[PDB]
Amino acid sequence: GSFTMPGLVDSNPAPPESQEKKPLKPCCACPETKKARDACIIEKGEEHCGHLIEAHKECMRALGFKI
Ligand SMILES: [Cu+]
C-alpha cells in the first residue's frame, strides 16, 4: 500500500534433522545458517563475518546448546 516491493530476492532453504529425540552437533545444527556462516568464511574468514556466526550461534542455542 503506497509504494510497495512485493518481490525481494533471497535464498530458499529447507529444514534439518528433527522428527525425533536425539542430540545434535554444533557443526551440523541450524545447517542453513551454518551454510551461510561458512560461505561468509569462504568469502573472507569468520572475523569479517561474526554477525553470521551470531545469528547461527543463537539459532543452535535454542536447541539446548553450549554456544
Ligand atoms: Cu557435524
UniProtKB/Swiss-Prot annotation:
Primary location group: mitochondrion
Residue window of motif Cx9C motif 2: 49-59
MF terms (GO), sorted A to Z: copper chaperone activity; copper ion binding; cuprous ion binding; enzyme activator activity
Post-translational modification: Acetylation by KAT8 promotes assembly of the mitochondrial respiratory chain complex IV (CIV).
GO cellular component: cytoplasm; mitochondrial intermembrane space; mitochondrion
Cellular localization per UniProt: Mitochondrion intermembrane space; Cytoplasm
Key words, A-Z: Acetylation, Chaperone, Copper, Cytoplasm, Disulfide bond, Metal-binding, Mitochondrion, Phosphoprotein
Xref: InterPro entries: Cys_alpha_HP_mot_SF, Cyt_c_oxidase_Cu-chaperone
Tissues of expression: Ubiquitous.
Cross-referenced Pfam families: COX17
Domain CHCH per the UniProt entry, residue ranges: 27-67
Residue list for modification N6-acetyllysine: 22, 34
Annotated disulfide bonds: 30-59, 40-49
GO biological process: copper ion transport; generation of precursor metabolites and energy; heart development; mitochondrial cytochrome c oxidase assembly; positive regulation of cell population proliferation; positive regulation of cytochrome-c oxidase activity
Residues modified to Phosphoserine: 18
Residue ranges of the region described as Disordered: 5-24
Keyword Phosphoprotein among UniProt keywords: yes
Short sequence motif Cx9C motif 1: positions: 30-40
Sequence positions that bind Cu cation: 27-28
Family label: Belongs to the COX17 family.
PANTHER family linked: CYTOCHROME C OXIDASE COPPER CHAPERONE
Role played: Copper metallochaperone essential for the assembly of the mitochondrial respiratory chain complex IV (CIV), also known as cytochrome c oxidase. Binds two copper ions and delivers them to the metallochaperone SCO1 which transports the copper ions to the Cu(A) site on the cytochrome c oxidase subunit II (MT-CO2/COX2).
Subunit and partners: Interacts with COA1. Interacts with the chaperone CHCHD4; this is important for correct folding and the formation of disulfide bonds that stabilize the structure.
Protein name per the record: Cytochrome c oxidase copper chaperone
Native species: Homo sapiens (Human)
